């Protein structure tokens, strides 16, 4: 581990005991799985051996999650919920212990609602978390309802769109504290209100606060001259 | 190198090209299975040969951590930023030990400059709400 991660871990432990949901909104590549797998080792009071954590995530991330537990903190055993209907059922039925943590696709949790709801997932990870940025989503409408105590968001970039999408992430973190997306315009100075709301439950970085010895990107806007066949079709359109 | 594109049809064109110029290549459209994603990723890391990886920003990239890439190319740009920013950093991360270069390919006077202008206007709005 590293110092910014260890600060994030004592910050997590403070919010966990305070009963406060929040966002580990550090820049991409600073390491939100490594900054959260240590929860099982730090919150050592056997709660996490008697009952499960769970991870809600986009299908491509089911790569590293079922790998990283086995090399960072193999003390906690893991049973992913992805693959064929019959195969995931044959994994799942015996949760009705080895179930320290479970890893999931959004497009499975949005379907199998009853079969997740019947198990008391104590503490929640939700990941690449921009997926919840709209209250019109059947994802957001369902995911509000799981009876976990603490919800943790791993936003690879937080927020960063129109005010209904700010509200959609915020009202998933806190079901209270906020009245409506229409009134939340009042919650230059409105930026400082958003900052003073976010400061107690979102972390921040910028990579240079960690990466003293890794490169900045060279970024090239490369223009191209489109061809004859392109000009002919483009002009016809 | 990583190449990002937003049409599975364009990833087919890019595959037919990289087959044809004998590059060695590997692709992850949203039609690929979870076991296949895990196979392609673990074979793009750990191995010295595979020159180029083909991706979509809203499926192929998501948290997939290709530390073995040295460089990134956008053959497409989205109407929202952040997807491109994530797409870069799915290579540009603490597991690298290297220089990083990123390229965007754009046609002047077409429609992609509207996408870049909305992306710039959004990126400026998107900065102030963080820092």
């Amino acid at each position: 581990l590293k110092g910014y991660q260890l600060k994030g871990m004592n910050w997590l432990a403070n919010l966990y005991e305070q009963g406060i949901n929040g966002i580990l909104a550090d820049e991409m590549g600073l390491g939100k799985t490594v900054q959260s797998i240590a929860l099982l080792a730090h919150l050592a009071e056997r709660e996490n051996i008697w009952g499960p954590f769970l991870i809600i995530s986009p299908a491509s991330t089911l790569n590293n999650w079922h790998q990283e537990f086995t090399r960072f903190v193999p003390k906690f055993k893991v049973l992913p919920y992805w693959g064929n209907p019959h195969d995931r059922k044959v994994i799942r039925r015996f949760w009705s212990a080895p179930f320290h943590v479970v890893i999931t696709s959004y497009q499975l949790v949005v379907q199998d609602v009853k079969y997740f709801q019947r198990v008391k997932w104590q503490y929640m990870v939700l990941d690449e978390a921009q997926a919840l940025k709209s209250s019109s989503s059947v994802r957001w409408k369902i995911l509000l309802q799981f009876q976990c105590r603490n919800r943790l968001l791993l936003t690879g970039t937080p927020i960063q769109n129109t005010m209904a999408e700010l509200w959609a992430l915020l009202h998933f973190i806190m079901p209270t504290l906020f009245d409506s997306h229409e009134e939340f315009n009042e919650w230059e100075n409105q930026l400082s209100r958003l900052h003073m709301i976010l400061k107690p439950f979102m972390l921040r970085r910028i990579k240079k606060d960690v990466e003293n010895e890794l490169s900045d990107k060279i970024e090239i806007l490369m223009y191209c001259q489109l061809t004859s066949r392109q000009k002919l079709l483009y002009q016809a359109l | 190198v990583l190449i990002y594109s937003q049409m599975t049809r364009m990833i087919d064109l890019l595959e037919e090209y990289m087959v044809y110029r004998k590059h060695t290549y590997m692709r992850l459209d949203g039609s690929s299975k979870i076991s296949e994603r895990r196979d392609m990723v673990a074979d793009f890391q750990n191995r010295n040969d595979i020159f180029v990886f083909l991706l979509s920003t809203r499926a192929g990239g998501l948290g997939i951590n290709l530390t073995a890439a040295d460089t990134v190319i956008f053959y497409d740009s989205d109407w929202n930023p952040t997807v491109d920013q994530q797409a870069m950093d799915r290579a540009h991360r603490l597991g690298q030990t290297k220089q990083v270069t990123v390229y965007r390919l754009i046609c002047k006077g077409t429609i992609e400059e509207r996408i870049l202008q909305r992306a710039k206007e959004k990126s400026e709005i998107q900065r102030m709400v963080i820092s």
Binding site: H66, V78, L79, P80, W82, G83, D87, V90, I91, F94, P98 | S35, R38, D39, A42
Partner: peptide, 29 residues
């Protein structure tokens, strides 16, 4: 005369974790 389920129970019980673990290691690659 009455404990006779145990020698059936054990044969299923050892299958549960084995097949769940087998499927959870198709998740290796």
């Amino acid at each position: 005369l009455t404990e006779e389920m145990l020698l059936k129970r054990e044969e299923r019980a050892r299958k549960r974790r084995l097949q769940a673990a087998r499927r959870a290691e198709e998740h290796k690659n």
